[PDB]
């Protein structure tokens, strides 16, 4: 992946 | 915070 979040 | 993230 490699963003983040939370959704 | 609570958020996340990342910026
Ligand atoms: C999310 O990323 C931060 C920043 O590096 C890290 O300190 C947290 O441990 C990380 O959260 C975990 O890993 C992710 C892959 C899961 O979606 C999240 O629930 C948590 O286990
Ligand atoms: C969230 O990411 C910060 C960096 O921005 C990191 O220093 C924290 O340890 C990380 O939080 C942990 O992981 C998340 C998914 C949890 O909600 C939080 O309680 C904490 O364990
Ligand atoms: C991460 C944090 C958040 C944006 N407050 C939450 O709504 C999501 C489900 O997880
Ligand atoms: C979170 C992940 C990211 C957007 N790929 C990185 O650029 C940031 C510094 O931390």
Request: hydrophobic share 0%; glycine share 0%.
């Amino acid at each position: 992946x490699x963003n983040x979040x939370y959704x």
